[PDB]
Amino acid sequence: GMTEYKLVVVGARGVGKSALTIQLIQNHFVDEYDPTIEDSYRKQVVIDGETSLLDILDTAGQEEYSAMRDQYMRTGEGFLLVFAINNTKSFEDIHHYREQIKRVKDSEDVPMVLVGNKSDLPSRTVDTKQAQDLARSYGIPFIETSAKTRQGVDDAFYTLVREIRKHKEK
Ligand SMILES: *[C@@H](C)[C@](*)(O)C(=O)N1CCN(c2nc(OCC34CCCN3CCC4)nc3c(F)c(-c4cccc5cccc(Cl)c45)ncc23)C[C@@H]1CC#N
Ligand SMILES: Nc1nc2c(ncn2[C@@H]2O[C@H](COP(=O)(O)OP(=O)(O)O)[C@@H](O)[C@H]2O)c(=O)[nH]1
Ligand SMILES: [Mg+2]
């Protein structure tokens, strides 16, 4: 049979949320994608032998806090926390995103993966060690990705799926 997973991708504008999602869904790199479009994308994949339907909310929009937005976000079973390794502000923003996740899920135990995107770029500003300690302090996996070269893209989403499965066992 099959299993469905609702994934939500969050992080600062321009970190590559849409590029990452389109790599997962369409298996190529799309370097210009309207920064204002928020939508959900599907894709069925086999992950550890199990047919997995991924429903991925690529976030955009305004920074508004309302019960409507909380309702969309609360539907997510797991979250990708995305920063760009060449943008320190996007990395500093991660703490805020995780807090809003914890708020709408009413739990500190929410499946999440920390994703340092743009690993293909030469002028890294966020050290891999800084990111690993942030993920360790959250108790979550960390992966560096490049939506440009597709490095780590599959594993980032599949690791999040594996984190959800565990959480569902409780
Ligand atoms: C680009 C800049 C354009 O405006 C855009 O597409 N954005 C920016 C606004 N969005 C947004 N931003 C933040 O954080 C911005 C930050 C970080 C520290 C706090 N502030 C002020 C300026 C920098 N946070 C957001 C949200 F938290 C949500 C949201 C709202 C309610 C509930 C939940 C629950 C879980 C997760 C999230 Cl993301 C929730 N929405 C937007 C938002 C939107 C977009 C960037 C993104 N993603
Ligand atoms: N070099 C490089 N550029 C990227 C990568 N991912 C996204 N980009 C670029 O970063 C910008 C923002 O990407 P986008 O997918 O729109 O980010 P979003 O706002 O988080 O949806 C665009 O110019 C993309 O071409 C990556 O892994 N490597
Ligand atoms: Mg986008």
Numbering used by the authors: 0 to 169
Paper text:
One of such hot spot mutations, KRAS p.G12R, is found in 17% of pancreatic ductal adenocarcinoma (PDAC) patients, accounting for more than 9,000 new cancer patients per year in the U.S. alone. Here we report the discovery of covalent chemical ligands for the common oncogenic mutant K-Ras(G12R). These ligands bind in the Switch II pocket and irreversibly react with the mutant arginine residue.
Compound 4 was bound in the Switch II pocket of K-Ras, with well-defined electron density for the covalent bonds between the ligand and the protein. Such an imidazolium adduct is consistent with the loss of two water molecules revealed by whole protein mass spectrometry. The nucleophilic addition from the η nitrogen also appeared to be stereoselective, as the electron density clearly indicates the tertiary alcohol to be of S- configuration. Compared with unliganded K-Ras(G12R)·GDP, the side chain of Arg12 moved closer to the Switch II region, and the Cβ-Cγ-Cδ-Nε dihedral angle shifted from anti to gauche. These are likely energetically costly movements compensated by the reaction with the α,β-diketoamide and represent opportunities for future ligand optimization. The conformation of our adduct also differs from that seen with covalent K-Ras(G12C) ligands such as MRTX849: the adduct is formed further away from the protein surface, and the amide carbonyl in our structure did not participate in a hydrogen bond interaction with Lys16. We found that these ligands give rise to stable imidazolium adducts with K-Ras(G12R) and directly observed the structure of one such adduct using X-ray crystallography.
